């Protein structure tokens, strides 16, 4: 039930999503080991992900959270980079995506920095890099990120290095 609709580069919605992508690149403490070396991206395509059932599933849970938190879902737009992006757009997020070795326990991780999510496109630590060239800094191969609507509700604050 998922359909992907292409946005035009002339669309304000394309432009605002590209800007959040571009403006949230930072340098990483691994010197580029995991996601590669770059200051900016070449955006090739932005598609809106449309699934009525997955949407209604998200809005139902959003209402539950909101009602537990003085009518405040605390909703954010955040990045997610994963080898399992195809499973996510078709089936949604679920417990099979829980990151067992994650520093905040077995959950699903999102980033404000697009470049942090980029570090996971080809797997934990960048895996072995792109399928074609085995290069975590490949400048040729097309990569994919999700820009996601995320319900935080009341969030537990972990101060960390």
């Amino acid at each position: 039930g998922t359909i992907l609709i292409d946005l035009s580069p002339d669309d304000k919605e394309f432009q605002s999503v590209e800007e959040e992508m571009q403006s949230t690149v930072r340098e990483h403490r691994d010197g580029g080991h995991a996601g590669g070396i770059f200051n900016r991206y070449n955006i090739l395509k932005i598609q809106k992900v449309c699934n009525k059932k997955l949407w209604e599933r998200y809005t139902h849970r959003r209402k539950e959270v909101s009602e537990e938190n003085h009518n405040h879902a605390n909703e954010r737009m955040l990045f997610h980079g994963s080898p399992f992006v195809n499973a996510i757009i078709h089936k949604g997020f679920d417990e099979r995506h829980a990151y067992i070795g994650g520093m905040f326990g077995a959950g699903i991780y999102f980033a404000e920095n697009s470049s942090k999510s980029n570090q996971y496109v080809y797997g934990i630590g960048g895996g072995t890099g792109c399928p074609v060239h085995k290069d975590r800094s490949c400048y040729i191969c097309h990569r994919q990120l999700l820009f996601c609507r995320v319900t935080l509700g009341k969030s537990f604050l972990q101060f960390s290095a």
Binding site: M21, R26, R29, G35, I37, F38, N39, Y41, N42, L44, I46, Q47, V49, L54, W55, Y58, R61, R62, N74, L78, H80, I89, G92, F93, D94, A98, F104, G105, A106, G107, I108, Y109, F110, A111, N113, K116, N118, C138, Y139, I140, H142, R143, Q144, L145, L146, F147, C148, R149, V150, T151, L152, G153, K154, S155, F156, L157, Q158, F159, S160, A161
Partner: protein
């Protein structure tokens, strides 16, 4: 999937050394995220 800390719906990972890093977040229910945009891109080699 672990549980959210009692009384909370998510965890925020605040950066406390790298002053330029933005926050990271963790949810423990798949229904608390919707994958709204799929972005296809290349990283660009700095000049």
């Amino acid at each position: 999937m672990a549980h959210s800390p009692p009384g909370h719906h998510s965890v925020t990972g605040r950066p406390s050394v790298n002053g330029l890093a933005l926050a990271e977040y963790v949810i423990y229910r798949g229904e608390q995220a919707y994958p709204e945009y799929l972005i296809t891109y290349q990283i660009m080699r700095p000049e």
